[PDB]
From a paper:
Polycomb repressive complex 2 (PRC2) plays a critical role in organ development, adult homeostasis, and tumorigenesis via enzymatic activities to di- or tri-methylate lysine 27 of H3 (H3K27me2/me3), which is a hallmark of transcriptional repression and gene silencing. The complex consists of the following four core components: EZH2/EZH1, SUZ12, EED, and RBBP4/RBBP7 (also known as RbAp48/RbAp46) in mammals. Beyond the core subunits, AEBP2 serves as an associating components of PRC2, which is deemed necessary for PRC2 recruitment and PRC2 activity modulation. Through interacting with RBBP4 and SUZ12, AEBP2 stabilizes the core PRC2 complex, thus significantly increases the HMTase activity of PRC2.
Via the sequence alignments, we found a conserved RRK-rich motif (residues Lys379–Ser390, hereafter referred to “AEBP2379–390”) near after the three zinc fingers in AEBP2. After crystallographic screening, we obtained the co-crystal of RBBP4 in the complex with the AEBP2379–390 peptide and determined its structure at a resolution of 2.15 Å. Nearly identical to the previously determined structures, RBBP4 has a seven-bladed β propeller fold, with a protruding N-terminal α helix. In the complex structure, electron density corresponding to the first five residues (residues Lys379–Leu383) of AEBP2379–390 peptide could be traced. The peptide lies on the axis channel of the smaller surface of RBBP4. Arg380 inserts deeper into the axis channel of the smaller surface of RBBP4, with its side chain sandwiched by Tyr-181 and Phe-321 and with its guanidinium group creating electrostatic contact with Glu231. Lys382 binds to a well-defined cleft on the surface formed by blade 2 and 3 of RBBP4, with its ε-group specifically contacts with Glu126, Asn128, and Glu179. Moreover, Asn231 and Asn248 in RBBP4 create hydrogen bonds with the main chain amide group of Lys379. ITC data demonstrated that binding affinities of AEBP2379–390 peptide to the RBBP4 with mutations Glu231Ala and Glu126Ala/Asn128Ala/Glu179Ala are reduced by 5- and 7-fold, respectively, compared with wild-type RBBP4. In contrast to wild-type AEBP2379–390 peptide, the binding affinities of AEBP2379–390 peptide with mutations Arg380Ala/Lys382Ala to the RBBP4 were reduced by approximately 20-fold.
Author numbering:
A (entry chain D): 81 to 85
B (entry chain A): 37 to 119, 129, 144 to 442
The structure:
Amino acid sequence: KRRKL
Amino acid sequence: AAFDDAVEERVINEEYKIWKKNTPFLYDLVMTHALEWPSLTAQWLPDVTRPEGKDFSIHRLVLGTHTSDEQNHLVIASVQLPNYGKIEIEIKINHEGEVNRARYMPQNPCIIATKTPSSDVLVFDYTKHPSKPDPSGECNPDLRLRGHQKEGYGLSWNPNLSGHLLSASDDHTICLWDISAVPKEGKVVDAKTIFTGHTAVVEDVSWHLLHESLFGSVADDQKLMIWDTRSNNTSKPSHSVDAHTAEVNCLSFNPYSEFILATGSADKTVALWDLRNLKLKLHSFESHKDEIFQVQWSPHNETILASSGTDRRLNVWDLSKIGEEQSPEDAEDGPPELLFIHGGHTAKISDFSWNPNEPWVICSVSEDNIMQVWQMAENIYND
């Protein structure tokens, strides 16, 4: 899963 | 005692110094641009203006914004390229949340699909909006595509069936919409089909480029799945491959080799696949130091592909060099199939796009809001 920031 | 390691960083800045110092020898083109906001997404539009008897051509990019306020935009930018040129924002369109991914529809590149933090996929026709965004702050998509419960990133237009759009989501599903017969006037469209074979976040989805019924998906369950829309069972793909030792974040079909594709993974490898025998991985490309998030084949060269991710590098690979001999000192810099390491970014790379009209030009964008348009030195891809 991507995480933003 | 945890942020001390994040304070290197010092290592990043030192490697950046070295990189900038050597760009004359490694590049034929390097353009660097700090965008107003970071873009999570980048894709060259297919069109190119070559003005009358001038030494440059005008190219365009689909970009987005990633800001934590309520003024996000889908962006169209223009890029003057020569035949170490400027970069201008041509259109901004109000967008609901940050733009996770933006992709133009091959059969009509005025049509852009975007992935949003709300689970919706939005469709815009950027010719139907003013060049300046709506100061009311309101988002007015031409279509609102419903079907997901969570955001995602995977987005793919069928190049052989106009308006057939796939999307991959953190809700473990893949949604297929068919907007071909729908007038783009703001309607909400429900998903025609929802594929549920994955058991974890679906990271990416991609249509085959020749077979209109075939597509592939990759997910946090470590699987590559090959689907066929002709099948009645939407819970079980045609093929399932244990593709990696960790999450699979991206895949890409070779546009010249109809049996060949590549996947990129949190196991830090790019895997090469042959649809005719998915039990056996053809090759593992191994030099990234962290999780890979994007992989893309060259639009001009069937043996060339590139990968990017959280190690802030963009690797260019040449599969024709697999097995080549290298001098033991030359064998230290990496495998023979590693053609080039782009080290221009000092933060995680979020997306990149091969320019479809100028061979070897790449646009890459990173989390610090840097956008780079660059081309490795011609002598590197001519040895």
